[PDB]
Amino acid sequence: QITETNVSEYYSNPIIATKLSEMISDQVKNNQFSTWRRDNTSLQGFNAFD
Amino acid sequence: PISADFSEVENAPSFLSLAENTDEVLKPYTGLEIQTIITNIVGDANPNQSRIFDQDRLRGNQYSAGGLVTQNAVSAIPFTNLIPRTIRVGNILVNSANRLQITETNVSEYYSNPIIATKLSEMISDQVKNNQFSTWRRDNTSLQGFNAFDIATINTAILPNGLSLESMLLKLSLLHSIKAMNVDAASINRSQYQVIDHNTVPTIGAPAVVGVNNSPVFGEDCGGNNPVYPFGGGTGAIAFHVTLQTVPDERKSYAIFVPPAILQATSDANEALALFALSMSEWPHALYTVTKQTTDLAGANAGQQVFIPTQSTIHIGGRRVLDLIIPRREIAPNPTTLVAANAMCMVRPQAGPDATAGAIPLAAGQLFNMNFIGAPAFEEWPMTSYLYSWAGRFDITTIRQYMGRLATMVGVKDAYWAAHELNVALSQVAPKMTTAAGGWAAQAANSAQQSDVCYSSLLTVTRSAANFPLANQPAADMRVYDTDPATWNKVALGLATAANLVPEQSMDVPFVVGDARASFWERLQAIPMCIAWTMYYHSRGITTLAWDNAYTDNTNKWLQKMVRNTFSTTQSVGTIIPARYGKIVCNLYKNMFHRAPAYVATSVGGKELHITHFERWLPGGTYANVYSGAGAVVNCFSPVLIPDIWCQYFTAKLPLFAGAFPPAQGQNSTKGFNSKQGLMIHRNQNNNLVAPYLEKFADNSSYFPVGQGPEINDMATWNGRLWMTTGNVQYLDYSGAAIVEAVPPAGELPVGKQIPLLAGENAPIELTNAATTCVPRYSNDGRRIFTYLTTAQSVIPVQACNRAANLARSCWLLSNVYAEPAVEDAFDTLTNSSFLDVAKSVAESAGEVPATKALTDLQAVDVSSLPSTSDPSNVLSQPAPLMSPPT
Amino acid sequence: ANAGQQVFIPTQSTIHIGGRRVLDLIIPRREIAPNPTTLVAANAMCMVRP
């Protein structure tokens, strides 16, 4: 016996930006993200450029 | 309506009263208006229970002028869509000696409703502009799984035309008309098989078999199992794709995305793909064939008789090669290998259950190998064979479900109803009338006259001059709108919208789709069209030869304007304009039937004009005439195609000149009009010739002055009919000389077609089944036409115009009733509220999503730089948006 | 009677515009790095190599 399924996409509950993202985009506007170093990373373990 | 007394004809409306334009809104002519009168059915009922196989005639008692009463008299329905391909001769079935009828269409882009970009495309452009601050290649979301670069290209450089969807819906309705024939015989009229071959009798016991490319004569099997186009004689190509990047560079501008709103069914999705492929390529892709068991008049001989549907002969030029882009199963990188491509399809295309031969043979059920990046060899199929394999599997109920899924993306109710109107106008067809003294006549079996036929517009249909495929092309008969692939791509994905493209709260199609009763109804919708066109032509006295040469004639100048304004050959500000006098026929239809014809919009600078099927014919055809008993042509009359009982028994209001002769009632019978109406009798140098009371200008013209023609008068036309309806008239000149036009053998008038009778029926008597209203007045060389009697033959009719005497005429014994224009399930009552709000929300659904600009703004680097802030969207101005204005 | 291929020269192809025979293009660096000193560093450094 076999079963099959189709995907759909989810526009319900659109996301809201955190203060963190808003301050980062703000820094992109006032700077060119030029303040940051080659090796800067968050506590999470990803670098800031990403 | 039928007059009961002379008071009723005398008080009938004038022709100018009914050709006035009217302002009120009106319901569509569904054809049930005739069904209530000529049939048993009163309410909705199973077509099989009703045996509408035997419900195909006008029936009733008739009264003779000599005073006898005939019972169960009959008149046939004039129209049909079937062209016989084998014919009975000498009680034996035999092949046709005559070449097949063909139709040609004009197809062009025109302006429609103004269009506008949706909220969702403003979203996509905001995504690109916000990306531009980064080093990262992911510009925008990839809608419904299509590649994001493809959404980026589809969402650019919109055309200001709007979108039509008309040619698509036509092809779908032509095919629905063809497959509709396949239901059981109890639900199709017998008369439909014997409008042309009156010697054949179809059997009720088996359903007709619809097939493809089978015809015995004149090369009409267009390749057979190795199909080619009936008109082009070539073969197409079709190729399927997951992304636009694999499409060859020569034709990337022509590609069509296939929306996934269709293909949502558990079954019949690959079939939906084939059907969608059919609705956007050239038509016909093959010649379809109806085959029906039939027998001789005695019921002795029996055989399978071959017919060609008219819908399968009418040409609508489109693309021959094409490229479709299949929806992806999940967002993912484009395939680099074959298996990755085959695994990724949402619906994987395959051949239908019918094998084909030739180069690239197709096995039944054969699957397609998807194209992919870096592929060693591009793959495609011939398209005529791909459409061939599925051709025998399409049917009415699946087209209904398909069309219902299509309904939820875009408006298709009004557009389909208009394309259906065009279907009926190009497909229903009647044979030319035969002159006689009595009630019935027909031409010789398997003759050129037997098969010569005409449109509801009184124009003859052209024939093929050589074996199929046709090396060359006929002049176009009518012009339709085309559907552009680019704007189709923008609208199918939700990037754009217009007022005609809005989904409708019914979420449903017109009643005609999905019914087995459809053929009968389509057959009945052609009648009003002819009633209006014949009133149009008979209001004036021009003869068929004069119409036949009118366009180029330089004998008279008015005749030229007259021909020139009846067709669509004007444009303005980039768009099509309706024939100036077609509006008159449109006006007549509304005033006479109290219904409204379907129409499309055209935008002229942004103003909307309506266009009905009456206003889009093209010049070049020949007008309908009648034949003699020997088959010689007769030119003297106005064009005619149907008997006038059809005209006068199915109207709410009728022009005075066309009414029936009233019944005998004691002393009083029929009556005329005289000098007290402002009329005058015409006399010439010859004392043994007399013509009726006629308009006073008639005394001072023998040739009409250049720039002028005969006027509307209803009373003079009436006396003209009273003169003709005596069995001995002369069609002559002011001086009594012969006119150039061919005239019938003396005392004869054209009469309706003969069909075999059922037990208990009687044939129509006398002039009870004849056109009468065709009174000639305008000769080809510019002379007036008069109707003359000798003096002695003149006395009673003149006193009858004076209302001192009475004329004796036959009539039908029938009453007047004209119906008003007019279901919840328990489940529907359970759910009615939720349906009422959701339907309201779908009307605004557009390209809408719950996220607003105010939410997306928070996610931006700089709100002021957003194109949505600096370019809020507007509806496009027409013909073009402003570019480089002087500051 | 006599089919064959035939050559045409577009009018757009012959119009003369501009004069910049030589040019230098500065290309985005996908990583936050100091200016390259070797060849391989410069190759790896670019947003997409020409």
Short mmCIF file of C-alpha atoms in Angstrom, two decimals, chain A residues 5-7 9 11 14-15 25 28-29, chain B residues 144 329-330 849-851 859-862:
data_model
loop_
_atom_site.label_atom_id
_atom_site.label_comp_id
_atom_site.label_asym_id
_atom_site.label_seq_id
_atom_site.Cartn_x
_atom_site.Cartn_y
_atom_site.Cartn_z
CA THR A 5 0.93 14.15 -0.17
CA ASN A 6 1.08 17.73 -1.50
CA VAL A 7 2.85 20.74 0.07
CA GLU A 9 2.74 27.42 2.05
CA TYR A 11 1.10 32.98 5.16
CA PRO A 14 3.40 36.69 9.73
CA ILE A 15 6.60 37.20 11.76
CA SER A 25 19.65 46.92 10.18
CA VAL A 28 23.70 48.76 8.38
CA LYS A 29 22.06 52.09 7.57
CA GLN B 144 4.71 28.13 -5.22
CA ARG B 329 7.31 19.45 -5.65
CA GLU B 330 9.43 21.32 -3.07
CA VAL B 849 -1.87 38.02 2.29
CA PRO B 850 -2.47 38.94 5.97
CA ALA B 851 0.99 40.56 6.32
CA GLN B 859 12.36 44.30 8.66
CA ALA B 860 13.97 46.91 6.39
CA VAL B 861 17.31 48.77 6.45
CA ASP B 862 15.72 51.93 5.03
#
